[PDB]
């Protein structure tokens, strides 16, 4: 569920998702339109696309299971649809971590919709 995604961003990237990734660029936040603006924004675009392709369960409310071992987040449980939500969230938390070199809140926080024209919307 979304609370577990916040948790994975805190564990993996050592940052709050609600503080640093809830209104950044065109896609980090609910929905999105336009071009991914930089690497962190493309991590958000891929996470949107990933949630968009989960069929069988609900990425917002279902609770998934995971363990930490061999130095990684390991998605588990007996339900394959809930394991795919977990995989979407794990991938995005790692992408954020790996792209901290480029993160630029000064330029991309609250970017604004004319900068994200609906005619430049990249398809998943
Ligand atoms: Ca989004």
From Swiss-Prot:
GO terms for biological process: arachidonate secretion; lipid catabolic process; negative regulation of T cell proliferation; phospholipid metabolic process. Ca(2+) binds at residues 27, 29, 31, 48. One of its GO terms (molecular function) is calcium ion binding. The active site is at 47, 89. It catalyses: a 1,2-diacyl-sn-glycero-3-phosphocholine + H2O = a 1-acyl-sn-glycero-3-phosphocholine + a fatty acid + H(+). Expressed by the venom gland. The keyword Metal-binding applies. InterPro entries: PLipase_A2, PLipase_A2_Asp_AS, PLipase_A2_dom, PLipase_A2_dom_sf, PLipase_A2_His_AS. It is found in: Secreted. GO terms for cellular component: extracellular region. Monomer. Belongs to the phospholipase A2 family. Group II subfamily. D49 sub-subfamily. This is Acidic phospholipase A2. It comes from Gloydius halys (Chinese water mocassin). The lineage of its organism: Eukaryota, Metazoa, Chordata, Craniata, Vertebrata.
